[PDB]
Design a protein around this ligand. Structure first.
Ligand code: CU
Ligand code: CU
Ligand code: CU
Lengths: 112, 110, 111
């Protein structure tokens, strides 16, 4: 395990009624695509390798502007994304294909 | 020693105007771990005090280190394990949909 | 040394999503996101966070552990700074809106 494993999953949740242990919640409807895990932490200078498996039914994106990373993983495909974390800081990991509050963003933290 | 509070949010806002900006038909139910992210160095022992403020029992799991607990509503449970592996691991609830009780991350840095 | 966090509002409504043969219906989600959500520093570090608010309304940026309770006017930028003198994981949240609308983040102070 010299690299990170990230699974992109789609979640289609429709629960018009939920009563658990006597507590009730109504009209729940949320659709989202998640990166699991969302956060990747590395040291400055580290050679980063992220094996992204897209389990979403559609093509998904993986982007980190700071390091020119911008990929599109086909549905069911697995792509290894590699780059060198030559800059310290916090950088958003996002999908350039869907609304950010649908396919929620993650973070790449490069510590000193 | 970490402190994570699990909170549930039942938000419903058909319409609301603030600073001249109108938002409509907002309906969202979610359970969240606060904080969501935990960062440790490889090899050190981890003690996570999880306080569940959700009205129902919640889950806290991290497969890589065989962690998986069910915390009753209003209860507090101390999770302890050793981060003997470096990487990024999903902290999730095994009881509810992933996009309802949003996942977090345990990062084990070398 | 100076992080860059951008707060964005998203008003998403998709009656019917149709892409590559997949169909999802009645999608509606309104959220405010801090981008990036996670900040990792070392104990004792002087932290500076340039918070740019792209939200059409006032937004909050708070970190209880370090007495950070700030409000950023719509479309304005504010530099928040403090010393991370305690190790741990601390919630970065908005004190103005519901936690599940304006999703929380984390400030991680490692030894
Ligand atoms: Cu996406
Ligand atoms: Cu849960
Ligand atoms: Cu807010």
């Amino acid at each position: 395990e010299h690299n990170f494993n990230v699974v992109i999953n789609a979640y289609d949740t429709t629960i018009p009624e939920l009563n658990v242990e006597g507590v009730t919640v109504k009209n729940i409807r949320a659709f989202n695509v998640l990166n699991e895990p969302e956060t990747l932490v590395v040291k400055k200078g580290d050679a980063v390798k992220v094996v992204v498996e897209n389990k979403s039914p559609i093509s998904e994106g993986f982007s980190i502007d700071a390091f020119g990373v911008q990929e599109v993983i086909k549905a069911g495909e697995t792509k290894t994304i590699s780059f060198t974390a030559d800059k310290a800081g916090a950088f958003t990991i996002w999908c350039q294909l869907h609304p950010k509050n649908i396919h929620l963003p993650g973070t790449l933290n490069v510590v000193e």
